[PDB]
């Protein structure tokens, strides 16, 4: 199976992970928030939590969200790429 090594930024912390390169983002986001939170908790950092209603997304440096329905590969996210896990509140 193909994999991508990505850097995830969450709460000013970088976390390296190995992710399936072919799955849609949609099926990785909630799973990734849980691994993230495990790492933050070991660092005694407050886990990431849903301010009200809204959507967790993986974002480029400029705020651009990945498409939920496409893979990392299809979106040109490769080894060493960095993504920000961000919550968008619905207001």
Residue numbers in the entry: 17 to 107
The authors write:
The ESX-5 type VII secretion system is a membrane-spanning protein complex key to the virulence of mycobacterial pathogens. Key to their pathogenicity is the secretion of a wide range of virulence proteins via type VII secretion systems (T7SSs). The ESX-5 T7SS is found almost exclusively in slow growing, pathogenic mycobacteria and plays a key role in nutrient uptake and immune modulation during an infection. The importance of ESX-5 and other ESX secretion systems (ESX-1 to ESX-4) for the virulence of mycobacterial pathogens makes these membrane-spanning machineries a key target for the development of novel therapeutics.
The ubiquitin-like (Ubl) domains of EccD5 dimerize and interact with the cytoplasmic domain of EccE5 at the periphery of the ESX-5 complex. On the cytosolic side of the central pore, the EccD5 Ubl domain formed interactions with the EccC5 domain of unknown function (DUF), which follows the EccC5 stalk domain.
